[PDB]
């Protein structure tokens, strides 16, 4: 509930600040909502990693090269992680 947010706007503020510690804090704030059994819109689970469990915004803790072709793709890398991920896009 609120609980969450809060944690999300910490989250956000570290999340800038160092990559590492926004992991810690993000995996508290997701480690919260299973424990608090709430599902929200987009806010944790469309701004997440797969296995670090931080925050994803491009530029802060992982980074995206937008690639032009004749088919639109994106290839972001997340610190936490240390991985390459890929994201296709049409139009
Ligand atoms: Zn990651």
Partial sequence: ???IDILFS???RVFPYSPEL???YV???LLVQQKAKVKIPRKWKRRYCKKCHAFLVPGI???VRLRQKRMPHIVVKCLECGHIMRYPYIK
């Fill in 27 to 29: 995996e508290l704030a």
């Fill in 1 to 3: 509930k609120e609980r």
């Fill in 61 to 63: 803790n992982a980074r």
């Fill in 22 to 24: 926004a992991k810690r």
């Fill in 10 to 12: 910490l989250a956000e």
